[PDB]
């Protein structure tokens, strides 16, 4: 029974993927999500879209209510969540317009809530405290890895993505900072996503594209928005045939061990009274 | 005239080391404590037991109200608080079940209120700048390295806690990065617990007790839930002994002098109109 | 048609380097700023003073309403801003009384709205990321830094500063941490108070004073507030010289390109929908 939560990022608030398209607004616990839940299908394959932002990118990434979008994915019956998420690239070898299937994060985002169980939600009981060893699930990353390859889509099998608060880009000081900690991408969405995925039981992957080189190499185009927008305008075809091809692979794998592992994992991290 | 807050932690919530128990809910001007304070006496030192946690456990590191606990001990009258901690290891000699008598804190933490002095409590006013080059009282360091000795537990005279805001654990990039920024181990509770205490005037000290190695050591059962619990329930008499047999010498000591200083430094930090 | 925001740091808060002086309260859509505006000129120069933390120090660097701070200048018709800022120094060559012409920034602030665009303000809609690349206009600082030099002044010509949360000072092993990170002085108040400049499409410099070696140098008087306010005692005549010096030259030069430029950056930053 998979069913396949997309959460897109900039570029691709509402990507045109889905067949059989189908509008609805939802409630949560913890308020609102950024816009309607899109469901539909790719193939056979059940698919409840997202826009991260809004579908008119209206939302900057600080005021996203991550733990209502989270929890309407998992509400709608979504076993995974495959993202895409916009990103500076902090190393030569990652170009503009590829992709990363990030394996890492390093948080330094200060405004968000990362967790459900903030002891103000009778929804959520309890003192939660989620491992993070492994941030996202590797047997989803494999696919789109794979995917990618058949695709013959520029690719990296992993990387370390830093998160920042933003909305402003980084000083060219904390863009060297960055790179001496060995972050791979950046950019300003990741976390508290992943984290909440996986207190959600959710297998949850994200698909990075690099638009930018930040502000630490020269002779490339400074980081703006609208450089990252061009860049996008360029290469998000490449991240929606990745979704297209890719989900009728989750679709046709078996998951119930992976399901029962991280369900179990977000089970007992929770301590009660 | 010593009397001695002692702060309980993950494993430690409410140990039974007071004679003579009497519980005491009280309020302060930043909220409620976690929970009553317990008063008693090890030998005929006074002292004030609190869970950090409150006793069942049920406040997560972030809305644990670190103002309210430290303004009650001080106006119960402590002159010391000696707290347990446990903690993740990030250095391979420091082993889970070991004590660290922390010297130094790295804040990661986000979400916390660091000062009483905020400019809207009147029990409080003025801006408050608090050094923080030595954050632990070294005299009661000094003794509780001493007894550790005397009492034959594997103990590291100092070390650098990294607090983080959690709930969540850290990923292993993050684990790996806080490594290389020479940290030792690794909790969500001494920050802003260590602060406060430096502008209530307080002598503080940290019995940190590792109880695994967070996510950066291969071949070593990975941290959760269940197994910093499980390390707990192994060893949390070490802290209980090292608690039981520290306080009896803090309170033959002379600590005129030290309280003094303190008392200086957290007045002159103070600007007033 | 140039006009000078001066916001006055620690030890500067109202300095009497304005004539023609005339006192003016203002409100913004972000609340009221640290003080009154105070409008004079130096020579033919309209200029406009801030008490960054109001005239009395009342309000500390967490509480500061940077957002109302910049707007308010803004709309009373600045053209630059021009501030001070007491720092630690985080190397050796930068002494006490050292003025540093800061070109970059690390940000270890949590609690700090950066941005005018918070979707919750009607002068202010819609997603704005502005570029951090070049913080500080190269500019006013060119100008600083060779007014400086005609002074006599100890001066640097970069730096970068480390932005604390604070109240609280620095822990040892944070100072140490900063250092390994090339951070060369460390502060309370420069972000977000640069980031707003750049998005208010203002020309924005830093006049950073050194007045103490934080926590991390040996033989050297530990940072206490009173440590701070006794260098600026001393040297604080040097930053208002250096202000009454500067400002004239700026009047004389042109701006209409470079101020065009921030403007365009500014205006490009911000998605609608
Ligand atoms: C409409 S452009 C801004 C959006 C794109 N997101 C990702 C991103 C691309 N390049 C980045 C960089 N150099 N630093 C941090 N983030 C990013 C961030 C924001 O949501
Ligand atoms: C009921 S277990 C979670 C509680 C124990 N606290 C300390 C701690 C042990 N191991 C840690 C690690 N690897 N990283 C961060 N913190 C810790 C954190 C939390 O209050
Ligand atoms: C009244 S004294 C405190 C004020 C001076 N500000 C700057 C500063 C000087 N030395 C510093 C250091 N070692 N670390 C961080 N900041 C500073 C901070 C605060 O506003
Ligand atoms: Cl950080
Ligand atoms: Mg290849
Ligand atoms: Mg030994
Ligand atoms: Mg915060
Ligand atoms: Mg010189």
Redesign the interface.
């Known amino acids: 029974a998979v069913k396949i939560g997309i959460i897109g990022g900039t570029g691709l608030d509402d990507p045109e993927i889905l067949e059989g398209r189908t509008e609805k607004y939802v409630d949560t616990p913890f308020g609102k999500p950024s816009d309607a839940l899109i469901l539909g299908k790719i193939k056979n394959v059940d698919c409840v879209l997202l826009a991260r932002?809004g579908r008119?990118?209206?939302?900057?990434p600080?005021?996203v209510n991550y733990q209502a979008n989270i929890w309407a994915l998992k509400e709608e019956g979504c076993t995974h969540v495959i993202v895409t998420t916009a990103c500076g690239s902090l190393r030569e070898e990652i170009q503009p317009g590829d992709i990363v299937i990030i394996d890492?994060?390093?948080?330094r985002?200060?405004?968000r809530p990362?967790?459900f169980?903030?002891?103000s939600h009778s929804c959520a009981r309890?003192?939660?405290?989620?491992?993070?060893?492994?941030?996202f699930c590797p047997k989803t990353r494999e696919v789109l890895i794979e995917t990618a390859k058949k695709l013959g889509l520029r690719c990296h099998s992993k990387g370390?993505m830093v998160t920042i608060?933003?909305?402003?880009?980084?000083?060219?000081?904390?863009?060297?900072?960055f790179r001496?900690?060995?972050?791979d991408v950046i950019n300003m969405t990741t976390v508290p996503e992943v984290?909440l995925a996986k207190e959600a039981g959710i297998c949850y992957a994200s698909i990075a594209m690099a638009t930018d080189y930040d502000?630490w190499k020269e002779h490339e185009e400074?980081?703006?928005?609208?450089r990252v927008?061009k860049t996008l305008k360029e290469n998000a075809n490449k991240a929606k045939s990745l979704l297209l091809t890719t989900i009728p692979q989750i679709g046709s794998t078996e998951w119930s061990e992976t399901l029962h592992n991280l369900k179990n994992?977000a089970q007992?991290?929770?301590?009660l009274?």
Chains 1, 2, 3 share one sequence.
Not at 56 to 60: K, N, R
Not at 104 to 107: H, K, L, R, S, T
Not at 165 to 176: D, K, L, N, V, Y
Not at 268 to 271: A, D, E, K, P, Q
């Open positions: 932002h008119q990118h209206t939302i900057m600080s005021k890492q994060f390093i948080d985002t200060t405004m990362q967790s169980y903030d002891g309890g003192v939660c405290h989620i491992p993070m060893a492994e941030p370390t608060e933003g909305p402003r880009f980084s000083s060219r000081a904390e863009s060297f900072m001496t900690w060995g972050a984290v502000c400074a980081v703006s928005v609208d927008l994992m007992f991290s929770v301590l009274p």
